[PDB]
Amino acid sequence: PIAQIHILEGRSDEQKETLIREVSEAISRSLDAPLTSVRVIITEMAKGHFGIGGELA
Amino acid sequence: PIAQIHILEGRSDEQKETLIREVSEAISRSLDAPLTSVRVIITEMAKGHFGIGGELA
Amino acid sequence: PIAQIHILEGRSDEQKETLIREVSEAISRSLDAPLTSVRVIITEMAKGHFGIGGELA
Amino acid sequence: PIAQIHILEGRSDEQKETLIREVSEAISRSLDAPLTSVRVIITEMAKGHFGIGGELA
Amino acid sequence: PIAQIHILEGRSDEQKETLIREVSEAISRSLDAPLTSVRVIITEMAKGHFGIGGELA
Amino acid sequence: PIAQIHILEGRSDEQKETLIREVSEAISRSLDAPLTSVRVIITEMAKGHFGIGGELA
């Protein structure tokens, strides 16, 4: 499986490193698929590039 | 709804702020869905990262 | 500009046609870009594929 | 945060429901983000649309 | 490298198989990357979901 | 067709320029579609934003 997560900028390297592993584990557990086949892509968004209800977050 | 718009870099903060609101309004109008449920993601592409007809824009 | 809009399935072809035109006009307006240069992708989501808070919405 | 997970088709609704909840809880854990603010998109891939090394896997 | 290719539906399995192999070989060539490390995703678009200039193309 | 390729950062401008053309040619050949209708988006990922098997590449 291939997961792309869109998150707001500001997180540290450690939180994003935990994000990749815990999500890959949750995908491997829920789908009974090999952990080694799971790939995770983290995409950071600037505050001016993400909107909720037509307004910036 | 969740909209991701791929645009070329070079726009100002104001044009992208208008982009998020006007697109979210157009999605809310066309789908009769609550404006607050609409999310918009702006993804900027460098000139060397976007091609048309096999050539750079 | 290229826009991909994730929406829950269930809309008619007429509503999804309205969604493409209203969003394209909104993108062309906010960025002062040629309308013919704007492309919109509609990606439908089944009720079993979209979640909010880990729960299927 | 918004997550889009590309998986090969074939899973049941119960497995894809488990996938949405376990991933959302993993994202909320790693980023200390509100669970209700996490959205997950499941995009199924036919066996004829996914390739590894130019060969259909 | 991971490639997602949005195409209008209608192609045969043989053409979409050719598309995956030719693109993977092109990516492996340009980046000097291992072919087995290249994955290609084909995302079909209905004629009612793709627009050019706000009009369904 | 619209192709988005997720590649690791570190490539030069020339390798990415070759990537756009060779992939657009492979898409145009495999689908018998006009080369001018093919668009390619290159998305770079930092080393801390891409995982394989729950670990960083």
Numbering used by the authors:
A (entry chain B), B (entry chain B), C (entry chain A), D (entry chain A), E (entry chain A), F (entry chain B): 1 to 57
Paper text:
The enzyme 4-oxalocrotonate tautomerase (4-OT, EC 5.3.2.6) catalyses the tautomerisation of 1 to 2 in the breakdown of aromatics in Pseudomonas putida. It stereoselectively catalyses the asymmetric Michael-type addition of various aldehydes to nitrostyrene 3 by employing its N-terminal proline in a manner reminiscent of amine organocatalysts. We hoped to be able to modify and improve the industrially interesting Michael addition activity in an unprecedented manner by changing the active residue’s electronic and steric properties by atomic mutation. Since 4-OT only has a total of two proline residues (at positions 1 and 34, both depicted in Fig. 2A) in its short 62 amino acid sequence, we expected only minor disturbances in the structure upon proline analogue incorporation.
Due to this limitation to modify the active residue and inspired by the success of proline-like molecules in organocatalysis, we set out to incorporate a range of non-canonical proline analogues into 4-OT. We chose again the 4-OT variant with analogue 9 incorporated (4-OT-9) for further investigation and solved its crystal structure. This indicates that even around the site of incorporation, there is no measurable change in flexibility.
